């Protein structure tokens, strides 16, 4: 019916892709070898997963994904893991030297060597689709290969297709935690080059996920495993509207239609609820109104920021499972009544709602208790302007002394690019400041 | 895949690298015959990064041995692991350096460098993807210093886009082992600062302090100090060999750790370090490793880092850990000791986690610090070198090899400029 290509770029991209495809194979009942334990229909039907899995041979489902990285270790880990016999061998593209957290490398020097092969594979996958609607790109701003190659691939895809939607799930640089010293430059350059070529980029934060795990899941040692599992839950809740029939279905275009008021402000924040451990699951009655109220608590944001510091421009409520539309209506009315949550005056209709019948599925050996209903929420708020200002301040602090600058300059990154990116980021901050002023 | 060409030069080179290859062969299950007899697939998954496979289940370490007198090489060849090394790569002279940098750089190195570079080219052409060159050598040693400077210059000219990493043994602050060590060190750094990508400074005196103090050793040997240095070396490149939650190759370390092209020297550290008896009374947690790493007494460099500030910090962890735990510990470190970090670099700490712990440990961590405090080493070297040069101390031994006063003058001036640059970057300026 409809189709969507999932592109995984870099370390975080490939890891989140592993988690996401595990969750999809669990939801649709697809064995790790592409087979179905209930393989009663072959090569068609509904069988609504035709969007994500192509039908080949007889009874083998092949995910419509492309894994790209310049460092072969994580792709080899995929090539020897549980799902090594699931993915098509031609879907795994590797370079031989990653970008070393240098945006210049992944954008100019190394990315130009495999960008053509990646685009050729993407075209071969898209030519097999009939209702291709969107592209999913998973990457982290700080990671050089992710950042640079993602910028390059986004430009190339925006040129090649143009009218296909381009959604991004990306790990925003944490306000306190960092893994690379040069995350500010990579982040600023990637944002500057990516802004006008993305329809909607969803923000997540590893530090916020740490806090969420510790508070709600009661887990003291939540490594990248729990982070990836929560991100995969969010992605699956976003794509469930396409994959399963709902009482109120939502395609991919409606997201950028409802969440992007201005072409330059398309950074919604992801949230998820309920997130409870199995121990407190039997001391809790998860109603619709309670999950709706918990969705707007600042302690459950996947991005470390204070939504009370800004105003909301658009909020999308995606419900799954045993959900009554009247309860959703009343809960939205109550949320709008709550005077602590402020919306921009020029958006009197600030909610978009979607209800799907498919309840969420818990991964065996997972952390979240099984629930009969869940809500994935995507909100575009002006609170991320403070995070943008923090990133710009860090960039200024590092760039006033030209710290790490020779590393980028040597790769062909002319110095004026940094000034252009800085002015563009200042302009984005000005945009956020202006749209947040009532009249 | 990525491959590393390990070049051994000098007595430090030969001994430290013999211990290093012992440790590496132990980690990959390679017995002294070269035949693989391990127990895990990850040992052979990235065996090619340090080994060449000659059909017959035999693996040859991609190492090049360089010296100017065959004694140390005979000792290495006759000892453990002698038969695994393919005998093609024992390239030695006959005269020795006599601890004279001028000799080893202009006469003996000039005679032997052609054979050494031919061996280097042979090993490099056989590679699949050459990643970088690792050099183990001393600075006070004439053979090490001179041959290493010459080889680094020649190889940098040969491959200008590869990673040039060196692990140098630096002069001690109190007990020097060579009369002409200051001149050798000055003339060595005068080229290392120009041709190398990063240099790890190891002091034998700091290792002795760690051995008597932490490990409670009473009879430490140069071999045990080499064991510590080899554990550090193995921890540095654990991401080039085994998978993990967050990997980092050598170029990533070079990018994240060198802010400006000339300030590339680093202070290495290691954790955990315990005596045998105290092992039964201390648990291995990420806070424990973090507190052991950021400790002045655990720094293998001859300087108290609390006298200056850090520019970049690398912390590569080994073993199953929680990333939240490591990140919280790094946040605590940066917050409680913010006065020890330069204000013009937010997010001073770079991290990486490999899932394979060292042999016998549940978890470990390797420390790499770029601190302005290392200016003490270069300032002491400049002071001693100036005091010796004012009286032309041992100057004829170097002028007889072709050196003039202008070369020493330029070396000393560049050293003073490097010290001045480190001092300049201690200003907050904001």
């Amino acid at each position: 019916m409809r189709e969507c290509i999932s592109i995984h770029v870099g370390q975080a991209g490939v890891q989140i892709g592993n988690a996401c495809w595990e969750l999809y194979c669990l939801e649709h009942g697809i064995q790790p070898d592409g087979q179905m334990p209930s393989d009663k229909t072959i090569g068609g039907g509904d069988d609504s997963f035709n969007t994500f899995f192509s039908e080949t041979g007889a009874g083998k489902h092949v995910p419509r994904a492309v894994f790209v990285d310049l460092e072969p270790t994580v792709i080899d880990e995929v090539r020897t893991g549980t799902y090594r016999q699931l993915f098509h061998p031609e879907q795994l593209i590797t370079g031989k030297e990653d970008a070393a957290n240098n945006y210049a490398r992944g954008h100019y020097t190394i990315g130009k060597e495999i960008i053509d092969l990646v685009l050729d594979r993407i075209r071969k996958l898209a030519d097999q689709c009939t209702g291709l609607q969107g592209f999913l790109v998973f990457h982290s701003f700080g990671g050089g290969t992710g950042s640079g190659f993602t910028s390059l691939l986004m430009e190339r895809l925006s040129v090649d297709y143009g009218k296909k939607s381009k959604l991004e799930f990306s790990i925003y640089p944490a306000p306190q935690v960092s893994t690379a010293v040069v995350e500010p430059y990579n982040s600023i350059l990637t944002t500057h080059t990516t802004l006008e070529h993305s329809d909607c980029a969803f923000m997540v934060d590893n530090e916020a996920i740490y806090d969420i795990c510790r508070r709600n899941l009661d887990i003291e040692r939540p490594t990248y495993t729990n982070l990836n599992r929560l991100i995969s839950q969010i992605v699956s809740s976003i794509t469930a509207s396409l994959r399963f029939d709902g009482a109120l279905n939502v395609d991919l275009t409606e997201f950028q239609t409802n969440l992007v008021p201005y072409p330059r402000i398309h950074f919604p924040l992801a949230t998820y609820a309920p997130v409870i451990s199995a121990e407190k699951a039997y001391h809790e009655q998860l109603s619709v109104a309670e999950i709706t109220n918990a969705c707007f608590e600042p302690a459950n944001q996947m991005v470390k920021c204070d939504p009370r510091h800004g105003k909301y421009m658009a909020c999308c409520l995606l419900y799954r499972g045993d959900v009554v539309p009247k309860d959703v209506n009343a809960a939205i009315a109550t949320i709008k009544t709550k005077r602590s949550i402020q919306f921009v005056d020029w958006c009197p209709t600030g909610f978009k709602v979607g209800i799907n019948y498919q309840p969420p599925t818990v991964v065996p050996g997972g952390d979240l208790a099984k629930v009969q209903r869940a809500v994935c929420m995507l909100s575009n708020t002006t609170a991320i302007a403070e995070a943008w200002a923090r990133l710009d301040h860090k960039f200024d602090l590092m760039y006033a002394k030209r710290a790490f600058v020779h590393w980028y300059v040597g790769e062909g990154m002319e110095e004026g690019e940094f000034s252009e990116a800085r002015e563009d980021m200042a302009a984005l901050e000005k945009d956020y400041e202006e749209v947040g002023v009532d009249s | 895949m990525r491959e590393i060409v390990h070049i051994q030069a000098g007595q430090c080179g030969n001994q430290i690298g013999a211990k290093f290859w012992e440790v590496i062969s132990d980690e990959h299950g390679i017995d002294p015959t070269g035949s693989y007899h391990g127990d895990s697939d990850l040992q052979l998954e990235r065996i090619n990064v340090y080994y060449n496979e000659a059909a017959g289940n035999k693996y040859v370490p991609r190492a090049i041995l360089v010296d100017l007198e065959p004694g140390t090489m005979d000792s290495v060849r006759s000892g453990p692991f002698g038969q695994i090394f393919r005998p093609d790569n024992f390239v030695f002279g006959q005269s020795g350096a006599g601890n004279n940098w001028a000799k080893g750089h202009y006469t003996e190195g000039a005679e032997l460098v052609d054979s050494v570079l031919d061996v280097v080219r042979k090993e490099s052409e056989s590679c699949d993807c050459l990643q970088g060159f690792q050099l183990t050598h001393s600075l006070g040693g004439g053979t090490g210093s001179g041959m290493g400077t010459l080889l680094i210059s020649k190889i940098r000219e040969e491959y200008p886009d590869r990673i040039m990493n060196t692990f140098s043994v630096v002069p001690s602050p109190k007990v020097s082992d060579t009369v002409v060590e200051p001149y050798n060190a000055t003339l060595s750094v005068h080229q290392l600062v120009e041709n190398t990508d990063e240099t790890y400074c190891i002091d034998n005196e700091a290792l002795y302090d760690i051995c008597f103090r932490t490990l409670k050793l009473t009879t430490p040997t140069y071999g045990d100090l080499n064991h510590l240095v080899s554990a550090t070396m193995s921890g540095v490149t654990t991401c080039l060999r085994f998978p993990g939650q967050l990997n980092a190759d050598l170029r990533k370390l070079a990018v994240n750790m060198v802010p400006f092209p000339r300030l590339h020297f680093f202070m290495p550290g290691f954790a955990p370090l315990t005596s045998r008896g105290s092992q039964q009374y201390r648990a291995l947690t990420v806070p424990e490793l973090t507190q052991q790493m950021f400790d002045a007494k655990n720094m293998m460099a001859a300087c108290d880092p609390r006298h200056g500030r850090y520019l970049t910090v690398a912390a590569v962890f080994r073993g199953r850990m929680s990333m939240k735990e490591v990140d919280e510990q790094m946040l605590n470190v940066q917050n409680k000791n913010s006065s020890y970090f330069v204000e013009w670099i937010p997010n001073n700490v770079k991290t990486a986690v490999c899932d394979i712990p060292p042999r016998g440990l549940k978890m470990s961590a390797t420390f790499i610090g770029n601190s302005t405090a290392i200016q003490e080493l270069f300032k002491r070297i400049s002071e001693q070198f100036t005091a010796m040069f004012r009286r032309k101390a041992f100057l004829h031994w170097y002028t007889g090899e072709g050196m003039d006063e202008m070369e020493f003058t330029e070396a000393e001036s560049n050293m003073n400029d490097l010290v001045s640059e480190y001092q300049q970057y201690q200003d907050a300026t904001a």
């Binding site: 200024d396 000005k430 202006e434 | -």
Partner: peptide, 25 residues
């Protein structure tokens, strides 16, 4: 005989790009 490479950095005057006030009249 060296000096730190410190530059006077400023984003002096940056205007917004989204015409959020274009139809305010």
């Amino acid at each position: 005989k060296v000096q730190i490479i410190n530059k006077k950095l400023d984003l002096s005057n940056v205007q917004s790009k989204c015409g959020s006030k274009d139809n305010i009249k």
